[PDB]
Amino acid sequence: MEALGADVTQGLEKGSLITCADNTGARELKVISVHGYSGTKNRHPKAGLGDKITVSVTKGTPEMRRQVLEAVVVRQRKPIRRPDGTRVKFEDNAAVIVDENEDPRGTELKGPIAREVAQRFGSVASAATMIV
Amino acid sequence: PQPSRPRKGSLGFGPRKRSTSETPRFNSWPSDDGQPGVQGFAGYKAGMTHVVLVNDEPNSPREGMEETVPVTVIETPPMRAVALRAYEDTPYGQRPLTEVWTDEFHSELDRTLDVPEDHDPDAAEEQIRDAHEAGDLGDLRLITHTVPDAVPSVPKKKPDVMETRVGGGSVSDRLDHALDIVEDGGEHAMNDIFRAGEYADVAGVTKGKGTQGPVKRWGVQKRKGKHARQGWRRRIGNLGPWNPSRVRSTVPQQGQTGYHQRTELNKRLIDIGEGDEPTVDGGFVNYGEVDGPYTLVKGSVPGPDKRLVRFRPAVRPNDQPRLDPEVRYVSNESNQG
Amino acid sequence: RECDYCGTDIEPGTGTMFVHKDGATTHFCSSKCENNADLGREARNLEWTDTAR
RNA sequence: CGAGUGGCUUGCUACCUCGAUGUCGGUUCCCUCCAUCCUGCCCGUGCAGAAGCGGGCAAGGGUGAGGUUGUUCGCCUAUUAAAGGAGGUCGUGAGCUGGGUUUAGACCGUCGUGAGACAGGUCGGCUGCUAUCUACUGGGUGUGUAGGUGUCUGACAAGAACGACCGUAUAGUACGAGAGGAACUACGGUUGGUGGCCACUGGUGUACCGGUUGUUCGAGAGAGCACGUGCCGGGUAGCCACGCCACACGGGGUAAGAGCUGAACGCAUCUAAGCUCGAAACCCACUUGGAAAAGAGACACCGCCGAGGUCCCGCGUACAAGACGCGGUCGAUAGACUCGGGGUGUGCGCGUCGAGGUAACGAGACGUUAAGCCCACGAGCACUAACAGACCAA
RNA sequence: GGUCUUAAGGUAGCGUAGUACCUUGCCGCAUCAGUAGCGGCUUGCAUGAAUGGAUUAACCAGAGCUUCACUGUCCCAACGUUGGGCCCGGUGAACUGUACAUUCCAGUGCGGAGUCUGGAGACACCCAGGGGGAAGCGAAGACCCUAUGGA
RNA sequence: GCGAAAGCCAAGGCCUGUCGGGAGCAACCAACGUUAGGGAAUUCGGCAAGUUAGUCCCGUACCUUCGGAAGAAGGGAUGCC
RNA sequence: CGUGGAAGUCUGUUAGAGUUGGUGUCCUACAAUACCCUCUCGUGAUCUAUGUGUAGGGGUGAAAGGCCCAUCGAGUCCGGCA
Ligand SMILES: COC(=O)C[C@](O)(CCCC(C)(C)O)C(=O)O[C@@H]1C(OC)=C[C@]23CCCN2CCc2cc4c(cc2[C@H]13)OCO4
Ligand SMILES: [Cl-]
Ligand SMILES: [Cl-]
Ligand SMILES: [K+]
């Protein structure tokens, strides 16, 4: 993929329960896989800020629940490193549901986004209220 | 069918034993290209700080912006090239022929060597030239030492002697270039060989850790789950199969870790200067204060503070030289805190 | 820059930036300041802090 | 239908062990095979392109995470370049695990008159030993080569030190009616592996500072105990990874293959002689070890009555013993002291205030006080201790 | 089949069961995915009425499954604490020992060799280590068969 | 303090649960503390560890043999002067 | 609403009894059945000291072929017996 412009320490794993930062009807997301990733023996597949991940809807509306959808990691608790050395960390771990062409499934996005995610996934940026 | 997995640690840095010389010895030298010159220098590790720098890379989306880069401060005072050794091409490889020494020696060099009182620098020079005429001359290298006396933080006064190659032009012109450096008094600085922004290969004898187990030494797993409570925590599963009925040297075992020679490739020289510009407040921890000739190497460098590190122009660079990087800021913040 | 907690000048190429739930941004100079903030303490009440003196 | 190769399955045999070679599965760690799943280079195509199908060379590297099941096997999910198979006593219990098989207890079904049985199911049900030899990982002492110091050489040896993917430009281009849709090349990044390092972020930090509960020293002050910190909060150095740095290109010779010239055989022919090319594979390049390489090495200087080394002493860039490295007054090696740089968070005492209370008394607040206390780092500083002196040696 | 054996011919219930071979039975629940678990169906290889059937509140160091919470069980390991370990004084065993013994790769041999054959490698001694091999040490195999054995 | 509980301390007893000296004291082992982000992905199985916790107030489901379930669950409070 | 204070009743390392898991430590042991944490019972079919009775094809057994002095699908000793 295109360079993020920040060094990420993947804060999530396969099976991690995260927040769904949108109005799709999905409240909680569970990480299943991480796009383009291949690990090593015994290693739990790791996901971080800027990654396109596959998720299952744990909590939400009856229609959205149980569905296997693709998402993009927007916020994470574990720090990331910006080129000026500064570390940036968030209050929660969050993702936004995305389609085949990487366009957000919902219309409105809840909470902030990292500027590096915005640059990589453009249509998610032009839906973001706050970009930090 | 039991998952595949790469082996624990590399087999190319073996045998994992204590180094013979604390002074690193390069096993390779750069290719002969342009003008003649000494193919290396040496300093003493001081510690680390960070530098705010302007992006030099033309292919970066951040070209011209401020970037924070980690830097290892190494004190690089002038060294003395006290002799010129010449090698001859024999059917058994390169063997040393003769050495051309000086008259002017450093006051405290007698702590390591048996300083020459009676030598003939002309008969030696003659033997080397008769060999060049015969087409038997191999390469030309200089016997060089450091002046630890110039560095107040390093306790030693006993010089670290090492051989360094001279490459560049023709064998005739680099013989003459070599003899000129020597006959003066041998004094040369980091500037004579290196320019800020060039890629150098730093060689050093690592931080000694004494004896450590397979987990630390080879990166093997600790015993997991139930296996961790049975009496075995940091011991490997087995020393090998039933057959072959011997323990193969490739199996991860205990022993000496650290105090090995490593040659760290492609290290960018951020800045070469003089003064107290990179010194940390309160002094570098376990080292001291820097106020003299220094070099700022990008990232980490093998060995602890006070150790002798060696420099050589990169034998295999990946990137093109982007000379004299713009240093916006150098951190002087205390390393304690 | 200046620390949004204590008030000292954050040494460049150092520190952490905490992004709150609402979007608010808080620059910290060290872990000490982050930890005092998590304890619910306000910088004005601690004497060692520049915002206090 | 015919001919075979292997020795993973199964069957057969009864050669070996019944004065015992510990049974499945799993795990962990190492090596290997090729009948190749991916990756490199190729040939064919029912090869437009894209995506495929089939075949050849090729074992360098990779081949991962999970849900049911003791399972091997297998079924299933999402990822992936791919998530290949097999051997090493069905590798691996003087390594682990003990879920299954297969003791002694018990139940159910079936069988039996019965004891009791079952190649049926089910609950429970133990894991010994101080390493003599050998083997290897690391560490020393001697001898050989035949005075010492310093610098090297390189026979050999090890490596995967690198593997792979995504994205951008190429390009909405070549190709194609359209749908759809590449490449060479140049770039940016990710992943796995590898080696090193701690400025930064993070962990630790029973150094240290503070808060505070119970109890004891009459109160105060200041302390002990509460498991090897009572608990809580912060945390320096160091050590660390979750942090940071580095890890080519190119040559040379080949395989499959594409060809040139060319004869046997006037022609033709990539081959028989000759030659130009051509794989992630081989050699070199690069990193690490390596004078015990018995052809036991080279060079320079010093010295043979003295060069050098050991002991000794103060110490670590070193360290389980041993070894290694540095300093030793012509000195900053260690300690004290004072600064600097850091940790904590405002000391004792006194003064003002303080809900109240006749008063006694009074939790606490403010000031004095960026206070007090403390530091595994640095600098200054010969004050203290590196003194005295011994020995070997051509 | 629309009686025959041998007296009767399985009624209430329960049922893929601690009983179901086929079997991971079929449908559903739950999970990304569930040989598990629960519900339903159920022709039950070979359920069933004091050989007691069914059911059940309460109880349980009893067997299986799910959720919330929690966490070094794991990703993936780090640093620290105490006692050992290591060096020194003192005390001072045992297991085991046909002999020889510096081995390695192949081969051969009663077909699972440090000792045979061919090569390769190999200067001696010592320290620490984790246990690959000595089909390591410990126990005249409890399995299996055999004995005109025992109980 | 509910307490013959913990923890601390008297009276009384003891330094004889009877070998010591040394090395920031390495690997490895036994007991154990703390670990960022994730949170059972571990494993036959949460085995091991951890979480919760005393007291008062509020409040409390299915089912039931009416006894129980029940401290269900869940929520709030808690010092000193 | 109070009184009353029942119970093979509950919590409980009270004393005391027991022994689920760690398949931890030990496994030439401290110990021929031990150590630590965890766990169960603790007014009753309770626990316990002493005295006393039952004896080997016999006892005793809330039954595991358990136990009858480290000895049990028939104790131990000596004899039969070389
Ligand atoms: C039926 O299986 C057994 O009986 C196992 C055991 O009893 C294990 C004994 C372990 C000891 C007590 C000797 O440590 C035994 O003696 O095994 C023999 C045994 O004991 C030495 C070894 C044997 C002999 C040939 C090799 N084999 C290895 C182990 C084994 C495993 C078996 C087996 C036989 C053997 C024998 O039957 C199938 O599973
Ligand atoms: Cl995955
Ligand atoms: Cl393990
Ligand atoms: K046998």
Ligand SMILES: [Mg+2]
């Ligand atoms: Mg696994």
Ligand SMILES: [Mg+2]
């Ligand atoms: Mg620091």
Ligand SMILES: [Mg+2]
């Ligand atoms: Mg800081």
Ligand SMILES: [Mg+2]
């Ligand atoms: Mg064995």
Ligand SMILES: [Mg+2]
């Ligand atoms: Mg082939």
Ligand SMILES: [Mg+2]
């Ligand atoms: Mg291979």
Ligand SMILES: [Mg+2]
């Ligand atoms: Mg096996």
Ligand SMILES: [Mg+2]
């Ligand atoms: Mg074994």
Ligand SMILES: [Mg+2]
């Ligand atoms: Mg065993």
Ligand SMILES: [Mg+2]
């Ligand atoms: Mg053992």
Ligand SMILES: [Mg+2]
């Ligand atoms: Mg079972």
Ligand SMILES: [Mg+2]
């Ligand atoms: Mg069982």
Ligand SMILES: [Mg+2]
């Ligand atoms: Mg069922």
Ligand SMILES: [Mg+2]
């Ligand atoms: Mg009846």
Ligand SMILES: [Mg+2]
């Ligand atoms: Mg026998």
Ligand SMILES: [Mg+2]
């Ligand atoms: Mg039998």
